[PDB]
Amino acid sequence: RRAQKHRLRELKIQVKEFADKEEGGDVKAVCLTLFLLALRARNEHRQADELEAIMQGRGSGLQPAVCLAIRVNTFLSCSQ
DNA sequence: CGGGTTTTTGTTAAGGGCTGTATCACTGTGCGGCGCAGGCCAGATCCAGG
């Protein structure tokens, strides 16, 4: 991670200086969207669907109201 | 042999937020029996006052 800062510590400046001009400065989703379109150019369409399902909390993860319904409706105590 | 040189990886501390684990007084499994509690009411049942 520290060397992924050391190798991208100029392109990181490029993406934060383009983020404020193109949309306004939203640093997460612009590189997310570049990663989606990079999978499009790399031609994986199911993998990007798993990506957006994760980033909507669907393909795994289990949004915590559903886990609450599972912990409640099967008589599971909190320790179990 | 090792200065140079490019990068890897770390530390520095002020804040923040997510996740992990300790802490607190308590549980239950240590034993058996039974119709019974509460309340209401008609039918005996006793008790002294003549």
From Swiss-Prot:
Tissue: Maturing lymphoid cells and central nervous system.
Result for mutant: residue 6 to A: Allows robust hairpin activity
DNA-binding region positions on the chain: 1-56
Post-translational modification: Autoubiquitinated in the presence of CDC34/UBCH3.
Disulfide bonds: none
Deletion phenotype: Mice display a severe combined immunodeficiency phenotype. The have a small lymphoid organs that do not contain mature B and T-lymphocytes. The arrest of B- and T-cell differentiation occurs at an early stage and correlates with the inability to perform V(D)J recombination. The frequency of homologous immunoglobulin pairing is much lower. No obvious neuroanatomical or behavioral abnormalities have been observed.
Effect of residue 5 to A: Reduced hairpin activity
Signal peptide feature range: none
Record localization: Nucleus
Assembly notes: Homodimer. Component of the RAG complex composed of core components RAG1 and RAG2, and associated component HMGB1 or HMGB2. Interacts with DCAF1, leading to recruitment of the CUL4A-RBX1-DDB1-DCAF1/VPRBP complex to ubiquitinate proteins and limit error-prone repair during V(D)J recombination.
UniProt function note: Catalytic component of the RAG complex, a multiprotein complex that mediates the DNA cleavage phase during V(D)J recombination. V(D)J recombination assembles a diverse repertoire of immunoglobulin and T-cell receptor genes in developing B and T-lymphocytes through rearrangement of different V (variable), in some cases D (diversity), and J (joining) gene segments. In the RAG complex, RAG1 mediates the DNA-binding to the conserved recombination signal sequences (RSS) and catalyzes the DNA cleavage activities by introducing a double-strand break between the RSS and the adjacent coding segment.
Domain notes: The RING-type zinc finger mediates the E3 ubiquitin-protein ligase activity. The NBD (nonamer binding) DNA-binding domain mediates the specific binding to the nonamer RSS motif by forming a tightly interwoven homodimer that binds and synapses 2 nonamer elements, with each NBD making contact with both DNA molecules. Each RSS is composed of well-conserved heptamer (consensus 5'-CACAGTG-3') and nonamer (consensus 5'-ACAAAAACC-3') sequences separated by a spacer of either 12 bp or 23 bp.
Similarity comment text for this entry: Belongs to the RAG1 family.
Entry protein name: V(D)J recombination-activating protein 1
The gene coding this protein: Rag1
Covered range of the whole protein: 401 to 480 of 1040
